[PDB]
Amino acid sequence: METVAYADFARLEMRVGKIVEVKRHENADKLYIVQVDVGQKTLQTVTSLVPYYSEEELMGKTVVVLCNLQKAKMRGETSECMLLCAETDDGSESVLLTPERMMPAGVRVVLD
Amino acid sequence: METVAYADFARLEMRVGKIVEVKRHENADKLYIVQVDVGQKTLQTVTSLVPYYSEEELMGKTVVVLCNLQKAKMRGETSECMLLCAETDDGSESVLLTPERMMPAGVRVVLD
């Protein structure tokens, strides 16, 4: 696609987060409500990733979230952040991004 | 900052890359030229990260790059991609982002 100014990257609020609550409705299927600790507040996202990852696997996991996306409703649940993943070219597998070493919840993602 | 449409995230070309060449000019200081394999092509960036990371440490490392930023010159060297990092709130330490598991060079970064 076309370039991209630095300003276009800057308008995004991306932070390291840690998953603190993973919720599965009883009547099921596909979606899970996830709470992500982003340092001084906790933001809700609706995922997506669970059979691929376990619920137990997601708990305490360090992740990367986009935090200033327009409020979204999915099946009536609010998504106010979204997890960043790398996905294979055929959509078969999606893997969460993470800082390569341990880092505090809430630290900003920046270009080097 | 203000929200953020999905479209604003979509205009960015972010991919998983692998560092394949790290170059240090003899007359020194701060900057290093890094080649990043992004699957079917290799893109140049100018970093930044080297004393913090070794050159040997960077070689073969899986990273995340923004690939469609306006061509930039730094000290006359072209930067045509930029590495994504998480940085502490005081700028003291910057850590490269990575998929949490091994993934091929070139796979796209997407929101879940």
Side-chain angles (χ1 to χ4, degrees):
Chain A
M1 71 205 115
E2 68 188 342
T3 75
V4 341
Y6 179 76
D8 298 311
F9 178 87
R11 81 171 82 266
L12 300 187
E13 185 189 340
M14 286 178 291
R15 300 187 178 275
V16 178
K18 293 192 188 15
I19 294 173
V20 291
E21 184 172 307
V22 175
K23 229 262 286 207
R24 200 316 105 98
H25 296 316
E26 182 76 346
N27 297 312
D29 313 342
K30 210 169 110 286
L31 263 28
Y32 290 53
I33 317 314
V34 171
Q35 308 297 330
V36 187
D37 177 358
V38 298
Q40 298 175 68
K41 66 180 179 179
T42 296
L43 298 182
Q44 176 165 294
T45 185
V46 173
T47 203
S48 181
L49 296 157
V50 271
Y52 185 80
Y53 285 100
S54 63
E55 289 173 48
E56 236 197 76
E57 221 171 351
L58 285 195
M59 281 290 322
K61 182 172 305 280
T62 300
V63 290
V64 171
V65 279
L66 175 55
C67 299
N68 66 326
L69 209 47
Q70 268 141 49
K71 219 58 83 61
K73 313 275 288 211
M74 181 52 90
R75 76 106 114 57
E77 314 283 8
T78 296
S79 194
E80 64 193 341
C81 68
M82 296 276 280
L83 299 154
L84 273 72
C85 300
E87 89 171 339
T88 50
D89 281 348
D90 67 347
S92 67
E93 293 194 61
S94 206
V95 164
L96 289 165
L97 299 190
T98 186
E100 68 167 344
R101 263 205 298 106
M102 201 175 289
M103 291 292 278
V107 293
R108 286 297 303 274
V109 168
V110 297
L111 298 184
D112 141 43
Chain B
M1 71 205 115
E2 68 188 342
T3 75
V4 341
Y6 179 76
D8 298 311
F9 178 87
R11 81 171 82 266
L12 300 187
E13 185 189 340
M14 286 178 291
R15 300 187 178 275
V16 178
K18 293 192 188 15
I19 294 173
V20 291
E21 184 172 307
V22 175
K23 229 262 286 207
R24 200 316 105 98
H25 296 316
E26 182 76 346
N27 297 312
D29 313 342
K30 210 169 110 286
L31 263 28
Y32 290 53
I33 317 314
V34 171
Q35 308 297 330
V36 187
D37 177 358
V38 298
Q40 298 175 68
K41 66 180 179 179
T42 296
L43 298 182
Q44 176 165 294
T45 185
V46 173
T47 203
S48 181
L49 296 157
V50 271
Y52 185 80
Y53 285 100
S54 63
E55 289 173 48
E56 236 197 76
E57 221 171 351
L58 285 195
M59 281 290 322
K61 182 172 305 280
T62 300
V63 290
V64 171
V65 279
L66 175 55
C67 299
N68 66 326
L69 209 47
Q70 268 141 49
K71 219 58 83 61
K73 313 275 288 211
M74 181 52 90
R75 76 106 114 57
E77 314 283 8
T78 296
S79 194
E80 64 193 341
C81 68
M82 296 276 280
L83 299 154
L84 273 72
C85 300
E87 89 171 339
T88 50
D89 281 348
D90 67 347
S92 67
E93 293 194 61
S94 206
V95 164
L96 289 165
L97 299 190
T98 186
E100 68 167 344
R101 263 205 298 106
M102 201 175 289
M103 291 292 278
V107 293
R108 286 297 303 274
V109 168
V110 297
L111 298 184
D112 141 43

